């Protein structure tokens, strides 16, 4: 498991081409996330 950019705690990937894609984030310590909700779901076939 890799390391944070020196002096930072995480990385943000901001898509620059698809202007509708929201951000993605990477952390490098498991202690920096807490899994609060468990969502069970199906995808729905479009009409």
Partner 1 sequence: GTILIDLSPDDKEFQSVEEEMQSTVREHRDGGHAGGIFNRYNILKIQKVCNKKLWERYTHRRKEVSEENHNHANERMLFHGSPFVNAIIHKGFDERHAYIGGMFGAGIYFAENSSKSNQYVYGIGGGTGCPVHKDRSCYICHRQLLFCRVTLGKSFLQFSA
- Supply the minimum distance, in Å, between the C-beta of residue 6 and partner 1: 9
User: To the nearest whole angstrom, how small is the minimum distance from the Cβ of residue 7 to partner 1?
Assistant: 7
> Which residues lie closer than 8 Å to 11 by C-beta, 6 or more apart?
4, 5, 25, 26
- The CA–CA distances, whole Å, from 14 to 8, 17, 21, 25 equal 16, 9, 8, 9
- Which residues contact partner 1 (rule: CB under 8 A)? 1-5, 7-18, 20-46
In angstroms, give the least distance from the CB of 19 to partner 1.
Answer: 11
């Amino acid at each position: 498991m890799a390391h944070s950019p020196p002096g930072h705690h995480s990385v943000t990937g901001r898509p620059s081409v698809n202007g509708l894609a929201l951000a993605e984030y990477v952390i490098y310590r498991g202690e920096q996330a807490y899994p609060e909700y468990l969502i069970t779901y199906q995808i729905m076939r479009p009409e």
